[PDB]
Amino acid sequence: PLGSMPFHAEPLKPSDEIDMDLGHSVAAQKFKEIREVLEGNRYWARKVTSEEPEFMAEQVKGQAPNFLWIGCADSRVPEVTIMARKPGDVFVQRNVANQFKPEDDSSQALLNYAIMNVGVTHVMVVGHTGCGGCIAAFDQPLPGGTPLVRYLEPIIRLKHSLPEGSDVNDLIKENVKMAVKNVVNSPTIQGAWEQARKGEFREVFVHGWLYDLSTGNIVDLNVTQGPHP
Amino acid sequence: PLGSMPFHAEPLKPSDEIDMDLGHSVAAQKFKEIREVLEGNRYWARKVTSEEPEFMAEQVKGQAPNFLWIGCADSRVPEVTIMARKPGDVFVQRNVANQFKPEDDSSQALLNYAIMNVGVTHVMVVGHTGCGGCIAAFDQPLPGGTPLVRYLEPIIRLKHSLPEGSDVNDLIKENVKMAVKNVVNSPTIQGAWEQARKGEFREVFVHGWLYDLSTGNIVDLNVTQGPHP
Ligand SMILES: [Cl-]
Ligand SMILES: [Cl-]
Ligand SMILES: [Zn+2]
Ligand SMILES: [Zn+2]
């Protein structure tokens, strides 16, 4: 033989394999930015499935997160990243400025599903510094000229009720507390609490948190409520 | 001197520092599961701010993500994690079964804000295998007895329109495509496309993706639309 390993095959390079894998995608061929995010995923997928396959097979079977995160759409607040969690840990609603509007049937459905079917125990409303909806709300008159301004009406009204001297972060914090109150007052939570008091259901809790972009820290606003005082 | 460093101070242990930092939180003292997730955050924050402070200070200043992710609340689909992205990269809407309902004013507001103010170029609706809303929808009669079933009415109706032999993943995929169509038909996108055709606005694109929990891979369904064919 021509040396000790004259016929040994090398795997194809990962980049070549990924390129071929992304051939299915029309848009990846057209937009470098789309190819980039899909490549990101393929390297992640290759790593997790070669180093944690048990974990990936557990995730196929179902989900049992203990938390529901009601947070902002803002790109700087990805819940799993900033809590150093894993897939399977946190059920999530994200919308502009982390509102939980009582009249929003889709939000009410999500909360009911989270509590009654998914099995979450803790609901956290999480606001964050630098929140654009709150910054916008802070300077608006009481009412609406754009979809956004109409959407922000409850935060505008809250701003107009806050004391003289309140700053943007005061509004962001109060907006968290307002959403917590709306979650607490939901038929879902009111129902779950009455059943818990009856010993017919687990206790479920609602919390209000603030993510401080300047430090990376989550601060508890200490507005937690449960079935009992 | 008693040796070479007889008065050298050691920092307090990180766990002690974090415990003290979480003293502010009432609930962390009450629920081990809450203390756990807050600790997770504090270790993450300590690491990023000591190893990437430039990045944290950039994030304080604002956000300019190129993508809007319209995805499911399911805890197994955290967008930044599965695309190996960072904070600042992806603006997010998450709701049950990744619907974009035309009548939902909060969803319309989020989309308008994303396009007109945040500056996103690409909107991805991302469904996923194992989607509970779709699994539930798959066996329901046409209509609603729970908030969930009422909420899922459009997916139930879609299921009833699919051909004989369609499976759960076929419904999940078609549900993605349905949401893409609803995004495309929005006043926001229709308006943005007309302005782009006029050369008065950038081109914006809508895509449909599927996250396969069995492999960790994102597959492009190839339903992308833009201002031009
Ligand atoms: Cl109350
Ligand atoms: Cl069209
Ligand atoms: Zn925000
Ligand atoms: Zn789902």
Domains of chain B, by residue range, sit at 11-62, 66-229
Helices (H) and strands (E) in chain A, counts: 11, 5
Q: Which of B37, B155, B190 to mutate to test the interface with A (most CBs of A within 10 A)?
A: B37
**Contact at 8 Å (CB) between B120 and B114?**
yes
Helix boundaries (H) for chain B: 14-21, 26-30, 32-51, 53-61, 79-82, 105-113, 132-138, 147-151, 153-161, 168-184, 187-197
Instruction: Just list the catalytic residues of A.
Output: 72, 74, 76, 128, 131
DSSP sequence for A196-216: HHTTSS---EEEEEEEETTTT
Among residues B91, B101, B109, the alpha carbon closest in space to that of B185 is found at B101
Q: How far is CA B175 from the centre of its chain?
A: 17
Distance CA B66, CA A33 (A): 8
Distance CA B56, CA B3 (A): 41
Helix (H) or strand (E) holding A220: strand A217-220
B134 is in an annotated binding site: no
Closest listed ligand to the CA of A193 = 1
Instruction: Please provide the CATH number assigned to the domain covering B66-229.
Output: 3.40.1050.10
Distance CA A70, CA A68 (A): 6
Q: Is B38 near chain A, with CB under 8 Å?
A: yes
Question: How was this one solved?
Answer: X-ray
Helix (H) or strand (E) holding B211: strand B205-212
CATH topology of domain B11-62: Helix Hairpins (6.10.140)
How far is the centre of ligand 2, averaged over its atoms, from the C-alpha of A39 (Å)?
28
